[PDB]
């Protein structure tokens with residue numbers, strides 16, 4: 145296997161060459177491919193001349209466009225503020241679940257708030273080992289009849305790990321970190337041989353401008369500093385006296401035309417303060433900046449005066465390359481240090497370490513402040529930088545494997561004698577893989593993505609009076625174009641292939657609303673969308689639809705229930721183990737998902753196949769225990785099929801299986817009524833009595849089938865129309881108005897019917913929808929708010945950590961954004 149790294153300069157190629165020598169990763173060989181600039185390397189990677197390069201966040205965005213089609217895959221993890229520990233989060237979440245769901249696992253945290261390596265399930269006596277994230281080491285379960293397992297100790301904190309590694313198994317003359325009680329870095333660190341001291345934040349990163357030689361007083365070190373985002377700054381010499389607002393006509397050094405810290409952040413501020421007579425005139429920004437400064441060095445620029453101060457020899461002058469000595473963060477600082485500029489635009493990680501000196505920060509509030517005050521004297525937080533590769537991802541694994549092994553082996557990735565910031569930022573300490581579905585939008589975050597886009601094109605913002613509806617198939621798209629035609633512009637349409645892609649479009653500002661099945665709301669809520677209105681399906685009460693706002697007696701959603709015959713008097717909820725169960729089919733929420741979640745919650749995620757003695761659940765393996773109850777009609781049937789061929793499939797089918805050969809069936813609450821009291825003509829349901837069956841309650845009691853509102857496994861939440869938080873008010877308003885025209889009682893229901901169609905069934909909305917009711921948002925967790933406490937608990941253990949879609953790690957990726 146091979147990894148071809150693209151380098152942008154002779155210095156960088158030389159460093160990459162050294163690594164080919166000095167870093168030995170078995171199975172994977174590194175090679176280095178030279179190109180003359182960032183852009184030429186991007187094109188090389190798109191063309192397969194190379195596989196990977198490290199890019200500033202500004203180039204990550206540029207690379208993500210169709211010209212190059214690169215994506216970020218690896219970056220240094222960062223942190224915005226201090227968070228609760230996972231174990232304590234988990235404890236709180238699971239203690240806030242539905243107390244009616246008894247015997248749930250509550251994690252055991254230690255005096256530091258971590259997971260005890262041994263975790264146990266009180267109500268079952270089962271114990272197992274966990275990793276630091278509290279996830280079960282599979283294959284370590286021990287039963288109550290045995291002693292708790294012996295589990296390896298948890299991995300040490302970064303500080304105690306660095307401490308132990310520096311000691312190298314028994315210390316002298318080198319830096320050994322000093323740690324506190326909780327195992328985090330002490331704010332003040334000192335070198336035990338040189339007498340130097342400096343500040344670090346809570347994960348051990350050095351605070352620039354704090355390095356203090358012995359015999360000097362140290363700057364104060366902030367404790368509990370968990371803000372590890374990088375900050376764009378403007379650095380100046382203390383021998384000049386101008387303020388930020390007087391920058392017009394000075395000489396400037398920038399890390400580069402396409403760098404966030406060297407271009408986007410300053411230019412953004414220039415524009416907000418109106419120092420730059422430029423608006424949206426798409427007069428380019430570079431041209432406007434060209435009028436602002438007298439002479440600058442801005443690698444990658446074309447205007448002549450914005451290259452006048454660079455000093456690269458011949459063609460290399462003003463190149464986005466280390467061969468231009470003033471390129472990059474350290475190059476811009478060199479350019480100021482050598483007095484070719486009066487101000488340099490770079491980021492805090494490139495500031496001098498030493499407290500004392502001729503340099504300080506130029507704050508946009510027209511004051512100046514010391515180097516170590518960048519957190520309150522800056523031009524904004526900037527996104528992380530990343531290793532990128534082709535969108536296709538053919539080499540992602542090889543690239544990750546190589547960098548994981550090189551870092552384990554401590555190869556010299558993050559410095560070099562040949563110069564600073566070669567291959568990677570010198571300030572980098574660790575590179576981790578990004579979520580697999582991450583793209584530039586989710587990596588940079590919506591605020592920085594739009595801000596970068598806004599510098600290149602006049603981004604017309606879609607109207608707040610128009611709802612762009614997202615459709616998942618052509619019939620829906622056709623019904624939505626009919627809606628647009630009569631809506632008078634209130635409705636437009638977009639096309640996607642599935643509901644999850646609709647969620648993505650709404651997040652990215654390409655659509656405004658979509659209707660989601662329950663099975664997709666967890667993912668949509670985790671990504672930050674909100675219910676706007678919901679489908680009210682109750683045919684027995686139209687009052688909430690006639691008078692909007694009135695109080696709803698029964699939303700009318702289905703209620704999953706445990707159905708048993710009145711004959712079986714021994715079968716309660718707690719003894720369902722090993723019994724005969726009938727399931728409508730695998731994947732059905734009331735017949736499988738809800739029961740699956742409760743059995744899992746209360747029995748250590750033991751397979752539902754193994755839990756029941758024998759069942760019928762169409763869609764399982766024909767040879768399985770869940771299929772032997774199934775009969776299959778005309779015998780070829782095809783037992784355990786997701787068709788009416790199987791006589792136990794569906795709401796009615798599971799009901800048959802119960803009366804025939806089963807102790808319990810899991811079905812919606814409506815199946816019994818619609819199939820007893822002679823409601824089904826078929827023979828087996830020959831006048832079966834509704835008083836012949838009862839439903840199981842979770843407390844071990846029972847109740848007549850009629851009390852399903854108080855004796856159910858869980859009620860389903862209604863389907864919901866979701867949108868962006870800031871668009872909820874608009875969408876509600878537009879939809880309610882449309883409903884007054886084209887709802888079941890709309891004033892123009894002859895023009896168009898929202899809740900039906902000749903083009904197909906359940907297009908956009910469910911055809912059985914009575915109306916859409918505004919979501920009354922309660923002050924509580926949206927998960928609990930939208931799902932209801934019973935469902936949240938039974939299906940998701942009332943946890944914000946389930947990952948039912950791999951989009952979730954990408955859409956919850958945290959950003960380095962401003963306000």
Ligand SMILES: NC1=N[C@@]23[C@@H](N1)[C@H](COC(=O)NCCCCCCNC(=O)c1ccc(C(=O)O)c(-c4c5ccc(=O)cc-5oc5cc(O)ccc45)c1)N=C(N)N2CCC3(O)O
Pocket residue numbers: 242243244678696697698699700853854855858859861862919920921922928929930931932933934935
């Ligand atoms: N924000 C928001 N949310 C709503 C709402 N607006 C709209 C519309 O929704 C509606 O239906 N409104 C119209 C009213 C029609 C009746 C519905 C009222 N049903 C309950 O309030 C309820 C739900 C779940 C459970 C549960 O089992 O946990 C219990 C319940 C208990 C909880 C803890 C406990 O120890 C004991 C409990 O004991 C019970 C005992 C019983 O005997 C019978 C029921 C319970 C009670 N849409 C949503 N998606 N929503 C989500 C949740 C929500 O309904 O609030």
